[PDB]
Structure 1
């Protein structure tokens, strides 16, 4: 489906452009083409095939979506949906409000929809996802790095490809994969689940996972901390004790107050300085 436009005398454009009818085409202007499409260059009969393909923009993935978010005035839709609020008594009025509150929150508490999309992926400080040596020549880490890795890999690969003006397919496809890696990191399992490529097909503890440790319904979460001046032992009854008192193994007591104690020591001839008492009790 293309319009054969044979030419002769003057020249045209370059086999790939969108034309409909464009300012000029060929032969010193003796040629234009009210009809749309993209240029194809024949070099024999100085003829030109112009398949019709007006320039439309239909992108995939985020980019696309992202655009939309930007290209959107809330102040608008706001009062817009506001006009479905009661008018269609019960049917379309339901959805309306639903969709509407969102906005209000966005609209109100200053933010920007576009934000929900990504191109700037944060990274935890190292010592929070450390890499440490352990046993006779081996170390350990957090899955993140891994997650993180694969991700980077993908993105950088991607770059080249574009830099390679490659078939938008593999490209798209690539992006596709990338996106995956993306979420894969944020919250693993929310769609298909990746595991240590090798060994235990156990999933990798992702952000969310790690976070709320939701893989337990945040009902059994590992809630609790360890105290410093704590201690434990078995109990016995002290008939001697007076209500507000309680027996305490010196030995145990000792540790719990070491510092204070130390000080006192020093505070008394018996102990010249600190490290003294310190070792002095070791």
Structure 2
């Protein structure tokens, strides 16, 4: 098939097709599952071993993987992959902080405090001080990560007109501006389905803006 109908290639009579001289060759680690009739999964779906792929459930998947449905070659190909949840930044860190049970870690560190090594007792103490601090205070560790950044009242970061009629302002306004701009841009990028790289960079910039 081509852009202009006159440049298209149409078979004159009955025959078989052979593809030669490709631009390149792509080697993939995957499993090929040729399907005769109909496929019950689509490209982008993730599949564990034993999941129905095509042909009413006759052909299934041997391994974990991501689904690529080839309509041209008439085959459901499963690229070997895992569903792993591995994240980056303050989101992941906040998750880890939320999952923490402070009493348990206090117990573990207490058991660590009985170790004959001086250094290990020292580290265990240094950690247990923080843990017990959070325990006594009633503060949750995940609060060390900001979901909502406070805004200082405008009179403590004034925009004022000087004697000459010109304006003088606080740098906190500029910092706040950077933060708001990058946050808004991030939200738009998320709504528009930007690639992982762009979003990642934007999040980094956001973190450094809050910094």
TM-score w.r.t. the length of structure 2 is: 0.83
| Distance in 2, Cα, partners of 1:132 & 1:8 | 75
Which of 145, 160, 167 lines up with 2:188 in the alignment? 160
Task: Tell me whether 88-97 or 120-129 shows the greater mean CA deviation.
Answer: 88-97
1:90-110, CA deviations, whole angstroms, 9 ceiling, x for partnerless residues? 132221111111100101211
CA distance in 1, matches of 2:163, 2:178: 26
Q: Write the mapping of 1:137-176 to structure 2, written as runs, cut at 5 A.
A: 137-176=165-204
CA shift digits 1:69-94 (9 cap, x unpaired)? 00110110110111110223313222
Cα distance, 1:23 vs structure 2: 3.6
**How well do the aligned residues superpose, as a CA RMSD in angstroms?**
4.1
Q: Distance in 2 between matches of 1:179 and 1:144?
A: 16
| Counterparts of 1:82 and 1:133, CA distance in 2 | 60
- Equivalenced residue count is 183
The offset of 1:36, in angstroms, is: 0.5
Match of 2:136 in 1: 108
- Give CA deviations for 1:211-256 in whole Å, capped at 9, x if unaligned: xxxxxxxxxxxxxxxxxxxxxxxxxxxxxxxxxxxxxxxxxxxxxx
Structure 1 or 2: more strand by fraction = 2
Farther off after superposition, 149-158 or 130-139: 130-139
Q: Distance in 2 between matches of 1:47 and 1:169?
A: 31
Structure 1 unmatched ranges of 5 or more: 183-281
The answer (yes or no) to whether the contact 2:32–2:75 under 8 Å persists in 1 is yes
In the TM superposition, 1:39-188 aligns within 5 A as 39-182=67-210
| Pairwise CA distance, 1:135 | 4.0
Shift of the 162–94 alpha-carbon distance from structure 1 to 2, 3 Å rule, reads: same
Question: In the aligned structure 2, how far is the partner of 1:38 from the partner of 1:20?
Answer: 9
Superposition pairs of residues 238-277 of structure 1, within 5 angstroms:
none
More RCO (CA 8 Å, sep 6+): 2
Matched residue of 1:41: which SS? strand
